Homo-oligomer: 153 residues x 2
């Protein structure tokens, strides 16, 4: 790509869904988390959660495509079990049955989310990203890799 | 506020709604456009448009509170008369019948929107903001003023 990237931790390969796993050392500015997978042919919804610990009470960033009402994506944060105000992008960048690349870039003030190489949505951090130590993926997809890379030398 | 602010263009004081007027010289990085006003007691919707010319066909940033379905705000861009994909924040930071301060900060890659001095939404620039030379405000509100300020 347009930036030199270096491995952080090692990839999750054909991780079975639902998948929960560590983000080693926590999210860090300049980190890129890329999921490569396929939206299932009769997909209704799927979920990527960047969370603090395993119980899902505290999800810094919930990313939830919904193949409903024309197709839209919900982004939100859960704190002490409580969902905050949703940010809905009224567009569906995934296609049922089709492969996708979904990349999450951690910046100082926001996540930037690309789908198939194109900017899709920004999400302002509501809670500290460094406290996210877990990724959880569930729903109507399959995945061939999750990789973790950084631009930081 | 936490930083000294200086006028960039004189205010529009008590502008009559619907209001359309110049943003003299176009939007600039670092400009803050502040609307001080009151949401009407039975508001349905109101609109703040940052647009290129009087026409309305090209709206860089359409900011549209809707007192509908629990309350939500629509952000979008219009290009050649066509609406792009809506960004909806499913929260209503305005109260019907109540004063508000609504502040748009032009940053290099996004607008930042503050409501009553709290961050409300960000909106990534889809077209260069400097082509915006016109503000249009309409709907269920009144304004005491619109100011244009910079940290300058
Ligand atoms: C219109 C509206 O606000 N709808 C919401 C639902 O989106 C919400 O569903 C939950 O949403 C969260 C993220 O906010 C997460 O995706 C949950 O899986 C999902 O069930 C619902 C219940 O919280 O409230 C509705 O009214
Ligand atoms: C759920 C959905 O996508 N609904 C949209 C409406 O929001 C839209 O209404 C228009 O929205 C634009 C900004 O996007 C502007 O606020 C107009 O005043 C409003 O009429 C409608 C027509 O474009 O499409 C619906 O599908």
């Amino acid at each position: 790509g347009s930036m030199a990237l270096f491995s952080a931790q090692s990839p999750y390969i054909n991780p079975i869904i639902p998948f929960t796993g560590p983000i080693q050392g926590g999210l860090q500015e300049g980190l890129q988390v890329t999921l490569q997978g396929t939206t299932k042919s009769f997909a209704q919804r799927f979920v990527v959660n960047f969370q603090n610990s395993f119980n899902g009470n505290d999800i810094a960033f919930h990313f939830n495509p919904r193949f409903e009402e024309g197709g839209y994506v919900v982004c939100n944060t859960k704190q002490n079990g409580q969902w905050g105000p949703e940010e809905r992008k009224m567009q569906m960048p995934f296609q049922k049955g089709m492969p996708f690349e979904l990349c999450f870039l951690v910046q100082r003030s926001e996540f930037k989310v690309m789908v198939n190489k194109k900017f899709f949505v920004q999400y302002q951090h509501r809670v500290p990203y460094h406290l996210v130590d877990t990724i959880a993926v569930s729903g109507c997809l399959k995945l061939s890799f999750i990789t973790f890379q950084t631009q930081n030398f």
